[PDB]
Amino acid sequence: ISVRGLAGVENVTELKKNFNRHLHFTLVKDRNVATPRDYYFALAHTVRDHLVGRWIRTQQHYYEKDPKRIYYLSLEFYMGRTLQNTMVNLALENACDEATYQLGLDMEELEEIEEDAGLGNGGLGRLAACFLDSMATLGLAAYGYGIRYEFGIFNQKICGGWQMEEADDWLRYGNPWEKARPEFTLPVHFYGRVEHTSQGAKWVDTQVVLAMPYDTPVPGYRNNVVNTMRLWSAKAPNDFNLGYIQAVLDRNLAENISRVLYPNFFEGKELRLKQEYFVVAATLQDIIRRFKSSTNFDAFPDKVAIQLNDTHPSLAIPELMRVLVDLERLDWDKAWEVTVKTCAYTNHTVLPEALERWPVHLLETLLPRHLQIIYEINQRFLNRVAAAFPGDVDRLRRMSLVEEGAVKRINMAHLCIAGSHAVNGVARIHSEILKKTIFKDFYELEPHKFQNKTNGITPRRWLVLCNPGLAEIIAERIGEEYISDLDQLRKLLSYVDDEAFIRDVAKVKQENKLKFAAYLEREYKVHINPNSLFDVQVKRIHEYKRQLLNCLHVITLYNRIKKEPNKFVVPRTVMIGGKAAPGYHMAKMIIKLITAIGDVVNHDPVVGDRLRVIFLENYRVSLAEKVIPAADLSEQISTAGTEASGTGNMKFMLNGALTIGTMDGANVEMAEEAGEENFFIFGMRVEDVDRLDQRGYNAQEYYDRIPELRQIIEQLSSGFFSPKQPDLFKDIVNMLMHHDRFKVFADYEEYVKCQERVSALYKNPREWTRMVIRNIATSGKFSSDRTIAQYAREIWGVEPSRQRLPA
Amino acid sequence: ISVRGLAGVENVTELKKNFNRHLHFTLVKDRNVATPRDYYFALAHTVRDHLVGRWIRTQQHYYEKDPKRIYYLSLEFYMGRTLQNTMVNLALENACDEATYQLGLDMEELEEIEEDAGLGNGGLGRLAACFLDSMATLGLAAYGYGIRYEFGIFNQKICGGWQMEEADDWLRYGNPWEKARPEFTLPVHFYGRVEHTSQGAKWVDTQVVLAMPYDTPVPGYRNNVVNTMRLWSAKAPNDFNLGYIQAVLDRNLAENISRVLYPNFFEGKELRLKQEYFVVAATLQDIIRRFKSSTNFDAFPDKVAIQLNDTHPSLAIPELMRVLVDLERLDWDKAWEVTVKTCAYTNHTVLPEALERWPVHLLETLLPRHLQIIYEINQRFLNRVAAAFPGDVDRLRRMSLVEEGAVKRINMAHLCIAGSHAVNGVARIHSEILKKTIFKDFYELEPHKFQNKTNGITPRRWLVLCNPGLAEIIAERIGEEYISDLDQLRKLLSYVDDEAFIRDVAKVKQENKLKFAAYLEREYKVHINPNSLFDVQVKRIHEYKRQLLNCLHVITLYNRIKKEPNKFVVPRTVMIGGKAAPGYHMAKMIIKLITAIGDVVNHDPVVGDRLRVIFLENYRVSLAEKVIPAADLSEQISTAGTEASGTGNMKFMLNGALTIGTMDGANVEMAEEAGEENFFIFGMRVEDVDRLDQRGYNAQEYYDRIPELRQIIEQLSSGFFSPKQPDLFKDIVNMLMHHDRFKVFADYEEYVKCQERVSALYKNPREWTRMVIRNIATSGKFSSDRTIAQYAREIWGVEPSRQRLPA
Ligand SMILES: OC[C@H]1CNC[C@@H](O)[C@@H]1O
Ligand SMILES: OC[C@H]1CNC[C@@H](O)[C@@H]1O
């Protein structure tokens, strides 16, 4: 039927009978009482059965071959739905489609019933998810380790234009993909004290929390490789607190560790630290167990790589030291050599308020042995700084893992650099910034540590799965090899003047837009013109992402329409979506502003259907898979030097949207690949930002010289968008005028003018589409298969493989 | 192979391949890594598959036939293990035995891995479990409704002779028998306030807790009937408490409702009341839902029977009134007529401190509408008392549902009597006591309400399952019909002089004793002589059960041995087991005393192996199934008038033990059935107890006149059994001498002398066994099939059926 595999008579028949088996025996239902949910679950279990044989054989294969194992430690895995992805990677999609059709069911309908696994906040968690997909596809013996949160990222409800948070009870109906492994429960220790004795230190009088693993299969693309994601759940020991009733009820305290994912500004809360240690301690025991079945720890770095995703699992470094020194009785220097060689660290931001700095008094109480080890690491590290740069006393204080001040803190990023053989940023510009500024001192001491690994996205989920129409028209011309080798899309360059292809690309986009326009009316009763330019900015709500700069453009368009109503303008649907962190007042104000503009714009009779402002509620992976293929314009407009990479940008590029963006994060490499003529770049570069900070940013200057901007500010201040509460947006205006760290006004003019260029191109469908083809054609670099191949070869010391395991 | 069904070639082959299917696909295991637990789970799932077809067909059958539905409401269901019971009732035991043997596995070994479902304390909960079995066996459309406690009755550990409690984390490895039904979640309301309006009262500003059902199958004996036990689990709503993190963590508060089973003295704790209302509110919604699919509530009592097991679900009465009056808008008198006709109440004790009396101020806050309804019930009920007995002012205060005093209380038993068309005791003597004393006033007002339903036990679990050896030798002579018609055991009377049978009965007992003797050494490293008389008292530790009277006999034997060491005595193993409630100090002291006697007796060289005292740790259903078939002597020695029925007594009778007991509870009917000559009855009758209370019980009198008793007390006081802590047992001595409500000393002489009679009979194996045959032969009355047949006909108005549903 498509790129979605074969629907063989033997297979369809077999799928139908296993479906019916599961509905009967597994769900305990008859057809007369079954709901669409029961049908979803029956399909899920049928597809799951096809995984297990390969899953068992994969893990047996690693035991025999004993390859180097890669452990990817993250506190976030933003997986989304699993059903379709599993079908795609197993080549079962057409077969299941046929089998369900023959049972009289719509598969697409059943797919919508699946809950997102939302065990992440955004980019970091989605990166981990793409990475797992790519690692299985490239045949690496890799394991994702994290926490099985019982509540993922909150569901966002918009009420009166305000964000409301709702617990994401994703496990309510059960999770068919996971397998509880209560038999492999491990203990994790907290609190206690350190005893020194005849042969070394001993950590005693600890409280024990049990870590229970749950295993989820991670299938590679059509290679019969199925890797494991292991997520730990907190359980109280059976003698815990052991009137009687309270002791039993107080078990909840220990089990709170895995209850909820922390939303995205660093807050030093005890439960977060407990989560961080919990994942690290249980994971390392598992790592070591598996190594001992392979004791000379000299070979440890030959058999084990540990990748620290951000500083969240940074306690892996002193935990590994603790185990090697205190328990295995290795000498400090050998243990340290092993530790540095096995660990690598990925930095994910340059925003200072995101840097993890734990108060010493917290670590003192919770992890007293780990504090001692950290002090010792610091001492020996600073002795090395001192010898390399004698007399440089300020370097010593800058490089210290211990920050003095009001409260003493441990800098977890400094810990990670010292205890890892590799440190990488997530895009070229970001990795350069790391070496030039934030970690300049560390780079000078150990230049060899510092690398770049530009982020990527998986072409399975982010093309084949969410945009089958585009996947198919591409397959027609160049075949199917590109799915696991996205560089082949370059071959599409020879079709940029092909009138048939141009027509098809544009047709697929139109179908996508019509499909999404329908979804909006069906699920949210909101009306949109599907012939308008779909202008979309979807990502977390943050001041650095400048949803506010978008808001200023939108208002400019509205004000230009009201000034010259009978003048022609390219019609646009501007869609903005994303969650604000619960405590982030300003982000919550931006959402209210967006809806408030919509309230005015969407009901102005003069505007007509020429301009529409829609806030996309409850943005998440499943919604991303719907809007991204429908987008014409991708808004990637962070202040230059603030967005480490971005990954949403790459998803839009692959799906036929043109990009308006600053020279920030991966936008730089994206524009470099496609050619700048095929991108809408505007605004300050990093160097212009630095220049502005030196002179001093004065927002008033822009307000004074730009009349169109002045009008918008006065509209906001006077209550134009808030008639009942005239001063509603005083906080926003005040920040823009006096306290704007992200220089919204400084890029306003170039942004508005660049937007005019976008609109002019959209008037010429043929030339828009040819530029689109030029973007899709050069998106190959941004496959996570490329990213992971680079980690494997340049960091982990292993060779990827496209070789299939026997079915 | 036995009474355990056919092992057909077709069936064995099919069981083996489904076993392997489940191990592979369901457990995700290979044979090389599988533990015995995995094998247990693979067998459990294979057997479970055979239930579901019949389960679905049973429930479909009830929907079509629309019979009267029986709802059995209990806060306790003491189910034990399910695997063997399911095999037995499905006739799959020999087939699975063969199939597992051929896979190279020992089924008995796998059976021991299953955790007890310990969702009850003792007799009340086990009664509910036997009742469910019998109701399915008799083809009644019956449902067990309760709470899915995540922690059942605590595991008892004995440490230094002291009881320690350990959380019973029974769900740790999962429960293959249950099916979550998240789709049938119902809301339950707490707190709030009552508004009065134009058309009646309205309960508003409530907090909502969700009730999520879990369904467990209940198979009848070989009739293809599979009924449902539905257990509610508490879930927080998704907007609950909705900084953000705390709101999510505080969800635990609502979910604490179903966290833990309260152990067995009435404590008026809020969480217990919440549990009581939670089960009642969710259950009644389900009851009504199912009735509306059958609105004229006149027919409600024709289609619905609700059995209140004790006063724990007594809130069903005002809850049903609330729904009918406030929501369905029926007039008070019609609603009340419906309520009385649908509800029936079973009383389970005469001990005053066990009676549930809830403080008004608690109900005021938690259930304000229900309080109003209760006051109205009381008012109308007392108007009826006043008219029937004019001027009798003390009757009015005695009969009131509202008790005045320090705190105002609601008497839940008075509520149950007023709102039910039937009230029953659980044995003839108990039901007579109810009418003569505790509820005399109520019986005088409404004599027709009061009935008796003598308890019973299921012959499936308590003969076939736990004593296959005895089941088989019985089947040889009289066939298999007795399993579902236990009255047929009378036919064994014609074998009392049969030398072959006598030999077989005695052989089975010896095998049972040797089997248990081995278990003791294997699992607890304790040594016993299997040729000794197995003297066993197993049940909850309470002063009324008089484990202390047993302790006095044991010490008497020891002291008689030490006085005349070279004199011959019948060797005995005295085994005592049972849990003490966590707050019950005296019960905890009795356990310590038992172990303390063992400490002295078991290591006295002079005693030899003539006397042994063993405390049976962690008594529960699975342990009951092991010790009961091994017992020679059943100790049923409560003070006359305190044990409402007992059910352990009946289990021992069925399994070839002789009974030493008082004329209490069901002992009276047991001795009546077998003939008193075939029982060892001793001690005061109820009337002798009354006589002693009138004169005043003086323990000193017995101490003064009985030298052997004086010696024991002085041994206890001086520290004979506690050399390090001489005064350890001062509390026990003091209670016996001055504060003994249960007249231990008053029965001492007759008990010791009666025990001598037991020992004399044990010296004559042939005559012991002939008396044993006489007991087994007349145990038929005590089948729960008989009990349930009586409820069905005399209370619920339905006819039992032995007719098989199609396979
Ligand atoms: O590296 C993944 C993401 C982490 N947060 C900042 C983003 O720029 C980045 O793409
Ligand atoms: O009715 C079941 C049991 C309840 N508790 C007291 C016992 O005598 C009785 O058998």
Side-chain angles (χ1 to χ4, degrees), chain B residues 456-720:
Chain B
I457 53 153
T458 179
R460 273 76 64 187
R461 183 169 300 266
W462 302 109
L463 179 55
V464 192
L465 187 151
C466 66
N467 207 344
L470 187 62
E472 189 59 16
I473 76 173
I474 294 165
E476 291 177 350
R477 328 274 173 167
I478 66 165
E480 286 191 6
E481 269 266 350
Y482 76 92
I483 311 282
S484 47
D485 193 10
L486 204 68
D487 280 312
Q488 290 201 15
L489 293 181
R490 280 205 175 268
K491 295 199 266 172
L492 290 179
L493 256 12
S494 60
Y495 295 89
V496 75
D497 298 297
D498 187 303
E499 210 63 33
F501 196 56
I502 291 162
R503 167 154 43 254
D504 279 350
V505 172
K507 183 192 92 290
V508 159
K509 183 54 68 176
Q510 199 59 41
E511 285 180 355
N512 287 348
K513 291 170 66 173
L514 284 158
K515 224 290 209 292
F516 188 72
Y519 169 88
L520 249 46
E521 300 209 340
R522 286 174 68 257
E523 212 94 61
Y524 298 97
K525 315 292 177 192
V526 282
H527 292 212
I528 55 160
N529 176 36
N531 291 120
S532 63
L533 189 164
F534 279 11
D535 180 347
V536 348
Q537 183 174 210
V538 288
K539 61 253 263 82
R540 285 166 45 247
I541 311 301
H542 203 290
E543 281 165 278
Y544 90 82
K545 316 259 198 197
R546 305 154 119 190
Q547 284 85 13
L548 278 170
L549 184 61
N550 198 161
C551 291
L552 295 191
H553 177 248
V554 167
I555 296 170
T556 300
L557 254 39
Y558 173 77
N559 285 341
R560 280 175 181 182
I561 286 162
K562 293 283 279 174
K563 193 163 166 63
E564 297 187 315
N566 310 120
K567 203 261 227 66
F568 179 80
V569 291
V570 174
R572 292 158 89 119
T573 303
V574 47
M575 305 171 211
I576 302 164
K579 285 167 190 184
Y584 196 170
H585 174 258
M586 189 56 70
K588 288 203 160 193
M589 285 316 289
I590 297 159
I591 292 173
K592 178 59 181 169
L593 201 241
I594 293 152
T595 70
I597 300 163
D599 275 348
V600 169
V601 168
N602 295 353
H603 307 116
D604 195 317
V606 172
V607 171
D609 60 10
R610 302 186 279 168
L611 181 61
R612 285 284 181 264
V613 188
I614 273 85
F615 188 84
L616 262 23
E617 177 170 321
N618 203 29
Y619 183 61
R620 58 199 189 286
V621 176
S622 71
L623 193 68
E625 293 166 0
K626 291 172 174 65
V627 201
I628 291 170
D632 294 311
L633 218 217
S634 167
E635 307 265 358
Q636 307 295 335
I637 60 175
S638 53
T639 310
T642 63
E643 190 71 85
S645 166
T647 51
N649 50 180
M650 305 167 185
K651 301 169 196 178
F652 282 101
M653 194 185 182
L654 191 53
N655 280 281
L658 293 183
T659 298
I660 187 171
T662 53
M663 280 297 192
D664 204 16
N667 299 353
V668 177
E669 297 163 74
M670 286 169 60
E672 172 181 335
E673 291 294 305
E676 288 194 47
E677 341 92 48
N678 302 308
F679 259 67
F680 301 100
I681 315 105
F682 73 96
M684 296 180 290
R685 316 307 204 243
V686 172
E687 29 283 333
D688 304 299
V689 173
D690 297 331
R691 267 163 77 249
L692 227 190
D693 278 329
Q694 284 171 359
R695 303 199 275 99
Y697 176 65
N698 180 215
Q700 181 68 45
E701 191 188 288
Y702 300 91
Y703 175 98
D704 282 335
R705 330 243 263 215
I706 311 156
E708 281 198 290
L709 186 57
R710 198 176 319 119
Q711 193 195 352
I712 296 175
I713 301 310
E714 302 193 321
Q715 282 178 314
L716 287 178
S717 297
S718 73
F720 190 90

Side-chain angles (χ1 to χ4, degrees), chain A residues 123-124 127 348 426 455 643-647:
Chain A
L124 171 94
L127 194 72
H348 288 270
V426 289
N455 283 164
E643 190 71 85
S645 166
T647 51

Side-chain angles (χ1 to χ4, degrees), chain B residues 123-124 127 348 426 455 544 643-647:
Chain B
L124 171 94
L127 194 72
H348 288 270
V426 289
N455 283 164
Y544 90 82
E643 190 71 85
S645 166
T647 51

Side-chain angles (χ1 to χ4, degrees), chain A residues 59-189:
Chain A
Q59 302 305 313
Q60 174 73 274
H61 174 76
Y62 297 154
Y63 170 63
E64 313 296 18
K65 268 60 190 175
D66 185 50
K68 185 165 190 179
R69 268 113 163 164
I70 316 308
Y71 297 98
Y72 192 85
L73 272 62
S74 185
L75 263 74
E76 301 190 21
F77 288 95
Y78 207 166
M79 301 297 276
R81 313 184 208 264
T82 297
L83 179 61
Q84 202 178 344
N85 189 244
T86 306
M87 289 189 294
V88 162
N89 283 11
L90 262 38
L92 246 18
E93 207 174 3
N94 272 337
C96 295
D97 208 349
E98 186 62 47
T100 50
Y101 176 91
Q102 286 183 20
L103 276 348
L105 302 161
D106 190 346
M107 195 164 73
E108 285 204 10
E109 190 194 315
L110 277 31
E111 281 161 358
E112 294 300 322
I113 286 149
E114 186 177 1
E115 189 91 357
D116 282 67
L119 305 193
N121 283 290
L124 171 94
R126 203 334 106 175
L127 194 72
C130 287
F131 277 13
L132 296 182
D133 184 86
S134 286
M135 288 180 303
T137 293
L138 294 185
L140 298 178
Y143 305 76
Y145 272 91
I147 298 166
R148 183 186 179 266
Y149 299 110
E150 94 172 63
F151 300 95
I153 185 74
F154 55 88
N155 282 315
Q156 173 193 63
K157 280 187 152 82
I158 306 300
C159 209
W162 299 99
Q163 167 176 302
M164 303 301 296
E165 301 85 16
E166 197 155 289
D168 175 38
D169 192 15
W170 73 294
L171 294 172
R172 177 187 37 252
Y173 292 97
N175 177 9
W177 310 109
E178 75 188 1
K179 180 81 231 301
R181 297 299 201 197
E183 65 270 28
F184 303 127
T185 300
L186 256 19
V188 173
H189 302 262

